[PDB]
Symmetry: D2
Subunit: 164 residues, 4 copies
């Protein structure tokens, strides 16, 4: 596509997939510009929103955005870039720890040529595919950067049990 | 082992065909399927999913066609999947203005599986199409019809056909 | 991911033919011409040589039940080299879990390969990637449906052996 | 609940990346993974054929085989492992530089629960998906280990044009 979107819960390998795709384009001598979030820990810039990238991205064939849920203007950015002929690849969570959608990523679903939702493996039961991220630490902050020390991926029934 | 599977994409992408392909697979394994449309294999047409009542509980698989028309689809699918049903939904992710059907987006975040199909561009005939363009003048977001009122188009065709 | 040769495989009752048709319908809707070949536009033949050159007038060529045609790889390659979108639905494996060599060859020549699954008709609980023959017969080709075959998961296939 | 998953496609399609993506998923769920290359615990081994791995693989939940086309006995190995309840994941070329199949990988297709054929991007025209590997050095050895110094991935028409010479 022109906008390709990779979603799924944490630990599903979304970033790995993003990089797999970028690497394919790099082997064909296509120029890739990789955008990461400031906060999150193959890169080009780290920013807190996509406005701050300015116009540098126009010099490249492929634009990759990692952790798309953190950028509040991601839909507009991707559309602008794709209209300028760029292949835009975005990796992002579709859902927060409360199973509520990141509205901006949803909007991207509707504008995307390609949408792939990856799965993880349930870290609780170890037996099923996992489509949900459960927060293991008490915090009401929606944006809380961290890894397996603060989150685990779970299947539907594990998510319910743990919520109780 | 309930689950939610979601099939999205623009019109003429064969979403309904895919829904039926999946249902047929379960039917061959003697699993009971209940098919809901917007007005054992059981069939019913309703205007909202509340109106289906509890009949669906007697079945292994629940299929919902044209999910964008049901305003309570997310809740329904979650209830059914929590009761152990395999729930399969076919739906438009985007309206004719490229805006998301908010309820289907919510379903993306709750789904075990998400597949976004493409159509073929009906304007240029040369590219994959991820968008639906309305060919008749009307501002009603809900307007039931086929190729007499809509065509599927690629990204650039959608832009050019919008400007004229 | 589509292409010039697209291949759809999997066991019986996986909906391969349905998927083939889904893809054909997409093209038809974009006013592309489609020629549909079945085993003994539309035509039924016993091998693809017998179709002659009629296929050249069409944008898309669809072959259903590809495992039955002994020359399918060559046909698909000729057609795809002539600019056709070639879509083939076929069993990858026979009832003894042995490959249909001509397909497995196509795999290597295909732009796109999708292996569909069925639902296990024995345990009713798991995805099925194998076809088990339920009637006694040693003919590798034996045309029929759920009266002669069922699709099964790996462990059911073993146990039923 | 053993299974065989097969990842195929031409060179530079990210097959090995995908293999590792899948392994990493299992690792995060504390499943043990044993990774076999050609010559929660993750074990690694390099061998020239799969007989040489012996029985160590039985201690693990997931078995991953990279570069499957190099192992002449891969089908039998995967089937044995999957029958013992292992999740077996294989990354391999389906086709050689002459577009001929690796027969053993084809056999695996027929035994696999899952088959995914990845594509690369055409390194010649830069404009299309690539499903074929073209060898850029003169050699008749079917096995010739190397990277972009000896191979490029190409689309169908580029493969044809390049072959004409
Ligand atoms: C589930 C999460 C995750 N996160 C964070 C944790 C990680 O830093 C990041 C997920 O990275 P990933 O897309 O899995 O490579 O987002 C939230 O801020 N809110 C949530 O509700
Ligand atoms: C693009 C559309 C389509 N529709 C309607 C027309 C069709 O009856 C139906 C699409 O059927 P489908 O989901 O493609 O099997 O949705 C809308 O109401 N609003 C839109 O914006
Ligand atoms: C499993 C089979 C099935 N068949 C036949 C039975 C059906 O006529 C056909 C099924 O193809 P389909 O799955 O519909 O595309 O193939 C064989 O000839 N040999 C086998 O080993
Ligand atoms: C196309 C090839 C490639 N090769 C080699 C080059 C690499 O070492 C390896 C492929 O790596 P890959 O499966 O992409 O991780 O196989 C052959 O020996 N013969 C062929 O015909
Ligand atoms: Zn679980
Ligand atoms: Zn177009
Ligand atoms: Zn079974
Ligand atoms: Zn090319």
């Amino acid at each position: 596509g022109r906008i390709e979107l990779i979603i799924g819960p944490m630990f599903a390998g979304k970033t790995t997939e993003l990089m797999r795709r970028v690497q394919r384009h790099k082997h064909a001598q296509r120029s890739c510009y990789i955008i990461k979030y400031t906060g999150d820990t193959t890169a080009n810039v780290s920013v807190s929103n996509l406005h701050d990238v300015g116009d540098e991205w126009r010099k490249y064939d492929v634009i990759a955005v990692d952790e798309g849920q953190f950028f509040p203007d991601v839909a507009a950015f991707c559309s602008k870039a794709a209209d300028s002929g760029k292949v835009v690849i975005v990796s992002a969570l579709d859902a927060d720890y409360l199973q509520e959608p990141f509205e901006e990523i949803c909007l991207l679903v509707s504008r995307a040529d390609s949408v792939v939702k990856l799965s993880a493996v349930c870290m609780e039961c170890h037996n099923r595919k996992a489509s949900f991220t459960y927060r293991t630490v008490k915090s009401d902050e929606r944006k809380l950067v961290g890894g397996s020390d603060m989150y685990m991926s779970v299947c539907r029934s594990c998510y319910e049990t743990k919520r109780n």
